[PDB]
Design a protein around this ligand. Structure first.
Ligand SMILES: Nc1ncnc2c1ncn2[C@@H]1O[C@H](COP(=O)(O)OP(=O)(O)NP(=O)(O)O)[C@@H](O)[C@H]1O
Ligand SMILES: [Mg+2]
Lengths: 232, 117, 413
């Protein structure tokens, strides 16, 4: 489905000190009648001389993928994409978490299987467990493991933070938690990573604070309500 | 009628045990062998399971278990049974074979492993 | 049995045939019977440029495979061979595997992202317009019409026009009332396209623009516990969305009762918060309000956070910002009755108004927006109306032609 309203724009790091025009010497000569398949977002490198100019496919029509036919009417549309696009270098995958091959296996069996294979659990008839509580020495890779197992699975993610909720004034935490849970449930399947849960639900003896008690009670009441079985 | 609930009756307010307020106190203790057997029979009614299941042995081996822990044990047994079949099921294919989906059954060995874990 | 690939503008397909012994006619018949492509559209070729044509005649021009008589064996077709099929229209080739969109990795939401994305409600403290100055003559005329001709029983409304200063202060110059039907708790404005264009032309000639909208609350509405009703808030938000000015002012005319029992008419000018305009432009508000709906709280299609309280229904006072009211005597008077009212403006009323202000200069006689609009009903909106409005604004000597035409039309020819 050769594209019509395609968009092809270059990258900043390769257009610095560029030799000049790219439409008639870098884009058209090597991509007119070339019939090269193109996918939106691909960083492809082309040469119209000694300088190699990377290009990012901003937009295509059809949006997903197409082929660069002479029907493609776009030129070098001015704007060079900055390196900031690679600053969010696809966050974290799986190869970026290493050294633990059993804890990650348990987390996968508890998370990726219920959210991608309810048929097995329905056939056996078991109720899969929801709550998971990572712990370990500080700075050992807990948040990283959670991000790796929640970004690779492609499910809706929701990263609540301990101090972030605690920093807000009294009367807002009780609303923020409920709004967070009600938003997460609405987008099944959903993962709610509550980092530093020890800050918002400490040991009751060690606090003796009214607002702490109230927020703990709100968290408990909300948590007991996750029995909707809506993949949260 | 008012029905309280607690864990240690000593920790409650001592003024709530006076005549007329809370005058009946009942102790829901840890079940014995027959209790554990009945709890397991209640919980494993819906699960598929092979005829080899020896619930009496599981009841006798479990000591100090309560109802919640026995529910967790049954769930662990089912998860172990799924995990042992995982070596042939491919996660990239959401089209799990229907005969495969109906060829999975929990046995006594999975229960023993879950009890060990 | 032979497998032949079929390339088209939509992509690639494959067909299984008996063999190369058949001709192009049999291949076309098989394509019609398998891919459901009609015979009159199918065009076969071996060149890759066949799909680059844009006309069935151009497709048939490639006669290397267009002719159905030619045997397929003579073309040396084999297993996995390449053929090009062109047909009218664009189709979706089946068998497409799912493809994820670009950049859809790491959908990490947050509490702050929830706060920003989810619509909330708060009462803005300081508005963009620090103070709005109302013309004394226009305010007096509007108050007189509301209190006497309506007795605060029928709702009346009008757009406010004036100039906007650098600091945001607005000097109200006149009020335009479009054709409308008023009742106890609603006011439907049957706005006229030509009349609105004439008003805009007058404002352009008068060097001003729309700055807000005014309406009055009946006696029952004043006694109710709100500053504005849901319908009034919705109408004001809709007009603000239509407007492009950040200094929009919603003015309320209310018959307040003092502690001594006297009835005093007050103009309360408030600027709607930009939260309300954001709500309206995102289609959150429900333009359908039932009689059973409470006018105290606004209607929204989706739940929002009203400050600290999470309620879909939102009190109207959360949308208004108190703006100081000022009075000034601008270059425009409003002694002439406002158009589209119960007392319809006619030529006799025009003559009476001219006779009343006979001692005033001719430029001062026509220094009334309603009179200018009534003239505009018989003048060119593109040229004559802006020129007359500019002459009124600059207080320049009126051209003899305009004065003669006005006098002739005001004296029954
Ligand atoms: N097992 C691991 N594999 C790979 N990188 C790791 C691992 N553990 C820690 N890191 C690296 O540690 C750095 C930061 O650690 P991080 O996992 O963010 O701390 P944390 O343990 O989540 N902190 P806290 O939530 O305060 O206990 C990152 O750059 C990770 O790449
Ligand atoms: Mg953390």
């Amino acid at each position: 489905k050769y594209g019509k309203r395609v968009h092809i724009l270059p990258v900043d790091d390769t257009v610095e000190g560029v030799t000049g025009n790219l439409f008639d010497a870098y884009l058209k000569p090597y991509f007119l009648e070339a019939y090269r398949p193109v996918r939106k977002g691909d960083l492809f490198l082309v040469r119209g001389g000694m300088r190699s100019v990377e290009f990012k496919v901003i937009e295509t029509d059809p949006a997903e993928y197409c082929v660069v036919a002479p029907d493609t009417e776009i030129f070098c549309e001015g704007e060079p994409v900055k390196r900031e696009d690679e600053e969010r270098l696809d966050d974290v995958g799986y190869d970026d978490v290493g050294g633990v091959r059993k804890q990650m296996a348990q987390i996968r069996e508890l998370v990726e299987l219920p959210l991608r294979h309810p048929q097995l659990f329905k056939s056996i008839g078991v109720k899969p467990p929801k709550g998971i509580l990572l712990y370990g020495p500080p700075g050992s890779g807990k948040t990283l493991i959670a991000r790796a197992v929640a970004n690779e699975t492609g499910a809706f993610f929701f990263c609540i933070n301990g101090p972030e909720i605690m920093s807000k004034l009294a009367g807002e935490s009780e609303s923020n938690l409920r709004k967070a849970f009600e938003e997460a449930e609405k987008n099944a399947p959903s993962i709610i990573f509550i980092d530093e849960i020890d800050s918002i639900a400490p040991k009751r003896e060690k606090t003796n604070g009214e607002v702490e008690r109230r927020i703990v009670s709100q968290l408990l009441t909300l948590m007991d309500g996750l029995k909707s079985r809506a993949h949260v | 009628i008012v029905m309280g609930a607690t864990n240690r009756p000593n920790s409650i307010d001592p003024a709530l045990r006076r005549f007329g307020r809370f005058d009946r106190e009942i102790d829901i203790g840890v079940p014995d062998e027959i209790g554990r057997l009945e709890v397991l029979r209640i919980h494993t009614k819906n699960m598929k399971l092979a005829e080899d299941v020896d619930l009496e042995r599981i009841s006798k081996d479990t000591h100090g278990y309560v109802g919640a822990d026995l529910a967790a044990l049954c769930t662990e047994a089912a998860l172990q049974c799924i995990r042992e079949k995982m070596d042939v099921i491919d996660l990239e294919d959401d089209s799990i074979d229907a005969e495969i989906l109906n060829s999975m059954a929990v046995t006594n060995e999975h229960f023993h492993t879950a009890l060990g874990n | 049995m032979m497998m032949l690939r079929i390339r088209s503008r939509d992509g690639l397909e494959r067909v299984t045939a008996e063999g190369a012994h058949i001709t192009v006619s049999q291949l076309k018949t098989l394509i019609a019977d398998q891919l459901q492509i009609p015979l009159h559209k199918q065009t076969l070729s071996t060149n890759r440029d066949l799909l680059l044509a844009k006309t069935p005649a151009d497709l048939l021009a490639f006669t290397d495979l267009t002719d159905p008589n030619l045997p397929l064996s003579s073309l040396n077709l084999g297993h996995g061979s390449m053929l090009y099929l062109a047909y009218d229209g664009e189709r979706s080739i089946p068998g497409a595997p799912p493809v994820t969109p670009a950049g859809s990795f790491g959908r990490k939401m947050t509490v702050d992202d929830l706060i920003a994305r989810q619509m909330r409600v708060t009462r803005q403290e300081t508005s963009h317009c620090d103070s709005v100055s109302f013309d004394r003559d226009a305010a007096n005329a509007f108050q007189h019409y509301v209190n006497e001709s309506l007795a605060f029983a029928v709702k009346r409304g009008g757009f406010m026009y004036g100039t906007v200063t650098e600091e945001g202060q607005v000097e109200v110059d006149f009020i335009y009332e479009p054709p409308q039907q008023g009742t106890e708790a609603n006011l439907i404005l049957m706005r006229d396209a030509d009349e609105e264009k004439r008003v805009d032309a007058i404002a352009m000639g008068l060097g001003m623009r729309r700055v807000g909208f005014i309406f009055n609350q009946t006696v029952v509405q004043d006694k109710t516990e709100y500053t504005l009703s849901n319908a009034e808030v919705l109408q004001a938000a809709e007009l603000h969305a239509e407007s492009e000015l950040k200094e929009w002012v919603t003015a309320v005319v209310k018959l307040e009762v003092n502690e001594d029992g006297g009835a005093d008419v007050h103009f309360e000018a408030f600027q709607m918060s930009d939260m309300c305009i954001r709500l309206f432009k995102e289609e959150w508000f429900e333009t359908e309000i039932m009689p059973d709906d409470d006018p105290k709280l606004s209607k929204m299609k989706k739940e929002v956070v009203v400050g600290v309280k999470d309620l879909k229904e939102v009190d109207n006072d959360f949308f208004l910002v108190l703006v100081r009211i000022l009075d000034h005597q601008g270059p425009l008077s409003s002694t002439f009755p406002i158009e589209n009212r119960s007392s319809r403006a006619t030529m006799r009323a025009l003559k009476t108004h001219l006779d009343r202000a006979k001692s005033l200069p001719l430029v001062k006689k026509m220094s009334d927006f309603h009179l200018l609009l009534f003239v505009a009903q018989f003048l060119d909106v593109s040229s004559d109306v802006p020129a007359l409005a500019e002459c009124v604004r600059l207080q320049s000597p009126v051209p003899e032609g305009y004065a003669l035409l006005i006098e002739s039309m005001a004296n029954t020819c």
